[PDB]
Design a protein around this nucleic acid. Structure first.
Lengths: 137, 146, 216, 141, 48, 22, 48, 669, 49, 48
RNA sequence: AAGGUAAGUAUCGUUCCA
């Protein structure tokens, strides 16, 4: 049920007898069913060394670049910084006295009874052909 | 408003009188001033007639203005986008109705408006592509007109 | 030439007390210590102005529940109430806000009031069409100066001379000018060649953009 | 997004699939901060009350619950999965993938359309239902 | 795949001995060289 | 051969509107 | 009078409890630094 | 040289110039060599080796990599041969076919491996004595000049065509320089270095793409229409986050949904242009909610206008996008209309009494000159009384003549028309009573049909009042045709269809006496404009005064009262007090008549009394009884469509110079 | 038959009498756009008249 | 389906009901649309 | 690369793994 810790012995998934799917080969990881950690760390450190060609310069450039954007287009939270600060002097009871807003429209406009959709009266079918007949003189 | 208006002047310097009357952009060019060996091989070129003298004295070149072309393209667009569940027959009936709505209206001007012809063919191909996609997701390499 | 013919006419000395880092990201105890640090407090920022800026209230944003689309009329003294120690405006910029309080310490012979109508929002520039109710021949500004300076000036009353009114959107504007012919009291409206002796009420009804005064 | 109920660990989502028999469980796997996931986590807001009779919506953050990424292919930014009586209801879209809606849409009627179609096809006892709309294109023109 | 197509043996070169950097498990074998050539000599050789 | 519609621009050399419609 | 009230008494909520909205809002603010916080970072990154 | 190598020369020069122009200085780096770090690592060793051995080694290594990628999900029905061709071991069932598919990156890697395998195998053929050195060079040149034919890599990255075409162009360049004099044509060229380098620049281009895709694929952990979603959810989330943050942590936090509902209600009220003032709300909460509403409204306006710009310019947009954009534009336009109507109410009429008197006296002088008797009220005993009712009912039913399914309001409308057909006398008595004593009308709904250039308003009128309006419209037009109210020049829609109108107008231009003559220096000028915002700028009281001239007071009062009525959208209303309603049944007549108000101001009472001719013998379209009348004024032809006005002058040299001087006097140039 | 802009076949039309009392029909056909939602491609004419 | 046209139907059913004429059209032209010349690609037979 | 998996239940074989 909601708001309960997971059982210690529970299988995280498939415990309900779920069946996974493989839409394509590329997506997902390999099925796959302390030297390894050192090798992985070595390769990750090697890759991280390889990105140091322009890392210190590109990150500084983007840091300076967003700060030029943050002038014309500020952040929303600090756009509401002062009002958020002004929210501090509201009494504890006044937050309890907030009114619950309700809908204005009536039942016959919020929840209409289903509108029956009837066919056109058949007098149209007769009139259409009646208009398509001509005299002789 | 001037910007939404058009003033066309014919004088010793300009031999053409231009105006879009009811969607028909017409250029009247007198025969007397600047013409030679007048013809009839173009179907959207109204020959004029001086009723007092009964002689071919002017020449009215007809054309479909940009407003009408844009309106027809928007009509085809709103036909295509309003096709969530409409049958193929309904879409094609709307297409034919829209086509003859202007084609019987703009008759001779359509010949001289090459961009209108290109737009017509493009929109017809759009309708065909919409139907073909409605049949199957993967568009065919060929597909018969029958 | 710190004082030239135009400097000793419109320029006035101005005092600014500025506090920084009031940012809400700081907790209560950290901000209390920050103001306790004595590093971030009101500072001596006296400088000169060629013209006083006027910041207007935004807008109702909702049709007056009774009279829809009510025209926002604000008295001039509410705007001029910025230039005193009582009120302080937060000219937030970049990461940290800056709370500045303004003060007047030398009234120029003629006081210029520029009005911040046109402002850029996060996306598109708009205008603030807030009408202002302002007199033209009687105003007192003595409350906006420190008494240690108030004794110097025996004339804190200003009379309007010229008024600037703008039309429409920023990209489509047509300026109009209300000029006072000194000696007489005929207020004349000039746009390009217009000449019309208006009454002292059409000056109040229209939305001002730049005002010229005279301390007499 | 934030309004809909959230699931924190692997057991909770399996229980939510199991703790219901007469509705459809519509789970939005992804990251509620994603621009894509936030586009449709408000559509799921605007219809949560409407489909209360035959649908319940839970949200799951795959980082918070890294137990279904490999089995259900949680690598698109946003994913929607429909479950009925502890059975994943496959749905045939215009897209190649027929197990999820891996894109965030915009219209509050079409999602109720899909949910009601899933419920209708699940009461019969199917495993694959067919959507009314075709998503082999975007009908843009 | 680049490092060998860059150092691919040359038409007047019967045997192109190169330094090779290979993984300890034979997973990969890089051509750890750059084919630096005297460019006037290179142009003359291709002229021949 | 393909079903794509070809623009009749440049295809009007020998045709008229009223022809083949009497 | 005694039927709809029982239906709403037995009815189960659809949206989260208010504390859950508060917590989810905190977690969302943790990531979207383009809106919240003062130290901007990546969309999914916690802090930078 | 032939065309197929001339174009090759231009296509080589095009890429050369493009590279020269798009050149940029290299970016400053830190010089982190790659193989040097490998040598530092304990996992690698260095060794002198023959190149062909290296190729045979790398081919096996890449083949093993690709077989591992194939057997990554344990799908044994895909097999890679030693030529890097991926083939099925058995005919593929559709589920397994879709289950075993690889993205463009895998295919590109396989094809570049096939290319390097081809090169290595050619060199092995050379080393095994299977081919000559000349044969080896020719084969290498063929490989590097026909990569597309030999390897289908272009099917997995289209940009490769450039390189493909580039190499072919290079071939042409070398061949025409190679096959010169007594050489002849044949496969005897081995100048491969020209095209060999191109695939290496392609290699340096694609190296990080594959080195990243493989890294994502071959790892323990795998990883894999947005602006209107940007400022709605983020802004609302920020507002709620702040409000809940400063809201006390007590049990009161149960009121989060209340705050969200308050935000939604305020946004709706601004959208509906309805006053929103919560009584018990604190002033800081109210201030923050007002700021939220203002910000979202600014974004809403900007986004709506930007989407409209996208649509009008012809960009590709969705159907739901069009629907939402049309809704937003309807809300914005109706807010602007509320502004304009409220401005008119407080500013009074924008038309001065002086100009109103001038227009009215012009109209009355015209009508007296035409000897026009006023239109009488529809009498109780009218011979054509039912005929007009029949026509009005048929017209009202034409909107439903093509229909398959009907809503409730539609069913009720059809019921009303058919009942009025069943009892014409009582219906016409009701119509007369409405025309005589009804001045208060129910609100008429509004919506908009989007042409993607502008929005055309569609007005829905009360079903019973539609019948009265239609009968009034028919009676007005029939009487205004029986007595010659509208002059011939006003034919927005006459018996002549618009194309025949165009033809008649052109022939009338041609039929003038000396229209195409310029020997003296005279000139024609022709003005085609439209009365801008003619409908909106119709003052109701002035319209009533003008209408009482042609029709009795009661009918004109009914018209101007019908124009003044509450317009109602989905949520918000506004009382129309300054603009004519074009959705009204008789509106056409008003506009037509009101056009008769303005065009004489253009013509003057004199020229108007020459085109229309004497009332005893009115003229037809674009014709004058005498030549002197045509030669007596600049304006020789005039035609007025609903809004469009079309004037055709004829200025002699002297009057043209006079008009130019008069203009330049008030406008220096 | 089927010639003339007001087609000769209109003379023999059944409602020829009542269409004699239909004046200004083209103008109201043009203004039909403001009363009915969907635009009429044949706004410029009317098949009856 | 003409009887269903008037019955009280949720929009889900109506959306999938207006396309019934699109199925008889596909069947009536099946020998042409379902062809090898068009729709180039592999073929699969129905199970039964 | 594609956008072409019908979903099932029946056994038998194998293999890793607990």
């Amino acid at each position: 049920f909601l708001g309960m810790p997971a059982p210690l012995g529970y299988v995280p998934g498939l415990g309900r007898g779920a069946t996974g799917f493989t839409t394509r080969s590329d997506i997902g990881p390999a099925r796959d069913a302390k030297d390894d950690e050192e090798a992985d760390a070595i390769y990750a450190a090697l890759d991280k060394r390889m990105d140091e060609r322009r890392k210190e310069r590109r990150e500084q450039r983007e840091k300076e670049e967003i700060e030029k954007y943050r002038m014309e287009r500020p952040k929303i939270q600090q756009q509401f910084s002062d009002l958020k600060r002004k929210l501090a002097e509201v009494t504890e009871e006044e937050w309890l006295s907030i009114p619950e807003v309700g809908d204005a429209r009536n039942k016959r406009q919020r929840n209409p009874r289903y509108e029956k959709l009837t066919p056109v009266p058949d007098s149209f079918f007769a009139k259409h052909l009646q208009t398509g007949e001509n005299h002789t003189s | 408003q001037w910007e939404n208006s058009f003033v066309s002047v014919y004088s010793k310097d300009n031999p053409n009188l231009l105006f879009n009357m009811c969607g028909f952009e017409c250029r009247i060019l007198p025969k007397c001033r600047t013409s030679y060996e007048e013809f009839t091989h173009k179907d959207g070129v109204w020959n004029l007639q001086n009723e007092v003298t009964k002689e071919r004295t002017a020449q009215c070149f007809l054309r479909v203005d940009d407003e009408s072309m844009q309106r027809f393209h928007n009509r085809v667009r709103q036909i295509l986008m309003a096709s969530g569940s409409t049958t193929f027959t309904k879409i094609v009936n709307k297409w034919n109705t829209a086509l003859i709505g202007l084609m019987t209206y703009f008759r001779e001007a359509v010949v001289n408006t090459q961009e209108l012809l290109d737009l017509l063919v493009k929109c017809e191909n759009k309708i065909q592509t919409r139907i073909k996609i409605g049949l199957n997701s993967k568009m065919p390499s060929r597909f018969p007109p029958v | 030439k710190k004082k030239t013919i135009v400097t000793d006419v419109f320029q006035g000395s101005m005092r600014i007390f500025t506090k920084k880092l009031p940012h809400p990201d700081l907790p209560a105890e950290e901000k209390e210590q920050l103001l306790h640090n004595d590093e971030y407090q009101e500072t001596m920022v006296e400088s000169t102005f060629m013209y006083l800026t006027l910041d207007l209230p935004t807008a109702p944003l909702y049709k007056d529940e009774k009279e829809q689309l009510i025209i926002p009329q604000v008295p001039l003294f509410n705007i001029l109430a910025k230039f005193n120690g009582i009120t302080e405006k937060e000219y937030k910029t970049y990461k940290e806000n800056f709370l500045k309080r303004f003060q007047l310490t030398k009234l120029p012979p003629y006081l210029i009031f520029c009005i911040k109508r046109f402002t850029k929002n996060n996306f598109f520039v708009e205008k603030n069409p807030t009408i202002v109710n302002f007199p033209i021949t009687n105003v007192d500004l003595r409350e906006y100066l420190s008494e240690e300076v108030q004794a110097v000036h025996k004339n804190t009353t200003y009379d309007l001379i010229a008024n600037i009114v703008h039309d429409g959107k920023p990209s489509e504007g047509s300026y109009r000018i209300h000029v006072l012919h000194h000696g007489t009291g005929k207020w004349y409206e000039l746009q390009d060649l217009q000449v019309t002796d208006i009454l002292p009420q059409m000056i109040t009804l229209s939305e001002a953009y730049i005002q010229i005064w005279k301390r007499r | 997004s934030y309004m809909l109920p959230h699931l924190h660990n692997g057991w909770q989502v399996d229980q939510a699939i199991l703790s219901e028999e007469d509705r459809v469980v519509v789970i939005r796997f992804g990251h509620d901060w994603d621009p894509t996931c936030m586009k449709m986590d408000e559509v799921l807001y605007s219809i949560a009350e409407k489909v209360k009779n035959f649908a319940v919506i839970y949200l799951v953050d795959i980082t918070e619950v890294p137990d279904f990424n490999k089995m259900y292919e949680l690598y698109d930014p946003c994913t929607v999965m429909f479950f009925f009586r502890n059975k994943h209801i496959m749905i045939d879209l215009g897209t190649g993938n027929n197990n999820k809606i891996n894109w965030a849409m915009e219209d509050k009627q079409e999602m109720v359309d899909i949910i009601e179609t899933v419920y209708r096809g699940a009461r019969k006892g199917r495993g694959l239902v067919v959507s009314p709309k075709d998503y082999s294109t975007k009908y843009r023109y | 795949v680049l490092k060998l197509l860059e150092n691919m043996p040359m038409p007047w070169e019967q045997i192109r001995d190169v330094p090779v950097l290979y993984h300890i498990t034979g997973a990969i074998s890089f051509v750890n060289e750059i084919p630096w050539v005297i460019e006037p000599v290179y142009i003359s050789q291709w002229g021949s | 051969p393909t079903g794509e519609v070809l623009s009749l621009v440049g295809k009007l050399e020998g045709t008229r509107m009223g022809d083949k419609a009497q | 009078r005694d039927r709809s009230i029982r239906e709403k008494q037995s009815d189960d909520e659809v949206y989260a409890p208010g504390l859950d909205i508060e917590s989810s809002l905190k977690q969302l603010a943790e990531r979207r630094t383009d809106i919240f916080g003062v130290e901007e970072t990546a969309i999914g990154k916690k802090i930078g | 040289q032939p065309v197929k190598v001339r174009v090759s020369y231009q296509k080589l020069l095009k890429y050369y110039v493009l590279n020269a122009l798009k050149h940029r200085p290299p970016k400053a780096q830190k010089k982190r060599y790659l193989f040097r770090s490998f040598k530092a690592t304990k996992f690698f060793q260095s060794t002198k080796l023959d190149w062909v051995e290296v190729g045979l080694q790398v081919c096996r290594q890449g083949y093993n990599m690709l077989n591992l990628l194939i057997h990554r999900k344990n799908l044994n029905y895909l097999h890679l041969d030693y030529n890097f061709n991926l083939k099925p071991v058995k005919t593929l069932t559709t589920k397994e076919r879709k289950k075993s598919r690889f993205g463009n990156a895998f295919h590109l890697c396989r094809e570049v491996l096939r290319l390097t395998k081809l090169v290595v195998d050619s060199h092995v053929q050379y080393r095994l004595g299977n081919v000559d050195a000349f044969q080896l060079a020719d084969g290498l040149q063929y490989i590097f000049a026909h990569v597309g034919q030999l390897t289908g890599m272009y099917r997995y990255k289209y940009k490769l065509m450039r390189q493909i075409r580039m190499c072919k162009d290079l071939k042409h360049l070398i061949y025409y320089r190679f096959n010169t004099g007594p050489v002849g044509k044949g496969p005897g060229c081995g100048f491969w270095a020209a095209g060999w380098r191109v695939w290496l620049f392609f290699m340096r281009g694609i190296t990080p793409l594959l080195e990243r895709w493989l890294g994502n694929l071959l790892a323990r952990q795998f990883e894999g229409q947005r602006v209107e979603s940007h400022f709605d959810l983020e802004l609302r989330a920020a507002v709620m986050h702040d409000i809940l943050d400063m809201m006390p942590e007590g049990i009161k936090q149960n009121k989060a949904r209340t705050i969200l509902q308050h935000l939604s209600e305020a946004w709706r009220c601004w959208k509906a242009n309805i006053p929103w003032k919560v009584p018990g709300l604190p002033t800081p909460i109210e201030n923050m909610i007002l700021r939220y509403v203002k910000a979202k409204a600014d974004w809403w306006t900007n986004t709506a206008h930007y989407n409209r710009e996208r649509i009008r310019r012809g960009a590709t947009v969705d159907k739901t996008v069009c629907k939402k954009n049309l809704g937003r534009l309807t809300r914005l336009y109706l807010k602007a209309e509320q502004e304009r109507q409220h401005n008119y109410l407080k500013d009074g009429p924008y038309i001065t009494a002086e100009e109103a008197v001038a227009v009215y006296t012009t109209t009355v002088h015209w009508l007296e000159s035409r000897r026009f008797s006023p239109i009488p009220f529809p009498p109780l005993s009218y011979k054509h009384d039912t005929k007009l009712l029949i026509l009005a009912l048929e017209r009202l039913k034409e909107a439903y003549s093509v229909k398959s399914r009907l809503n409730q309001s539609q069913r009720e409308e059809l019921g009303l028309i058919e009942q009025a057909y069943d009892n014409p006398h009582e219906a016409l008595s009701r119509i007369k009573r409405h025309l005589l004593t009804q001045r208060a009308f129910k609100e008429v709904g509004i919506e908009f049909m989007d042409l993607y250039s502008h929005l055309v308003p569609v007005y829905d009128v009360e079903p019973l009042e539609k019948i009265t309006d239609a009968y009034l419209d028919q009676y007005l037009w029939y009487e205004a045709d029986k007595r010659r109210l509208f002059p011939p020049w006003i034919k927005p829609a006459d018996t002549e269809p618009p194309p025949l109108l165009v033809y008649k107008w052109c022939q009338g231009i041609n039929n003038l006496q000396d229209v195409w003559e310029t020997s003296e220096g005279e000139c024609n000028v022709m003005l085609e404009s439209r009365f801008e915002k003619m409908y909106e700028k119709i003052d109701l009281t002035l319209l009533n005064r003008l209408l009482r001239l042609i029709v009795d007071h009661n009918i004109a009062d009914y018209m101007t009262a019908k124009n003044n009525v509450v317009i109602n959208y989905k949520d918000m209303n506004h009382t129309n007090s300054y603009g004519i309603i074009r959705g009204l049944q008789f509106a056409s007549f008003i506009v037509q008549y009101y056009g008769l108000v303005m065009d004489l101001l253009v013509l003057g009472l004199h020229r108007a009394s020459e085109m229309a001719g004497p009332p005893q013998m009115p003229n037809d379209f674009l014709s004058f009884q005498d030549i002197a009348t045509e030669a007596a004024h600049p304006i020789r032809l005039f035609c007025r469509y609903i809004d469009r006005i079309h004037i055709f002058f004829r200025f002699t040299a002297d009057e043209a110079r006079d008009l130019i001087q008069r203009y330049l006097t008030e406008h220096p140039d | 038959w089927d010639r003339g802009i007001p087609r000769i076949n209109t003379l023999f039309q059944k409602d020829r009498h009542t269409l004699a009392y239909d004046k200004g029909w083209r103008v109201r056909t043009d203004f039909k756009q403001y009363q009915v939602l969907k635009q009429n491609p044949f706004w410029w004419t009317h098949q009856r008249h | 389906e003409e009887s269903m046209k008037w019955k009280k139907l949720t929009n889900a059913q109506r959306s999938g009901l207006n396309q019934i004429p699109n199925r008889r059209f596909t069947l009536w032209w099946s020998p042409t649309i379902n062809r090898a010349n068009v729709y180039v690609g592999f073929q699969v037979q129905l199970d039964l």
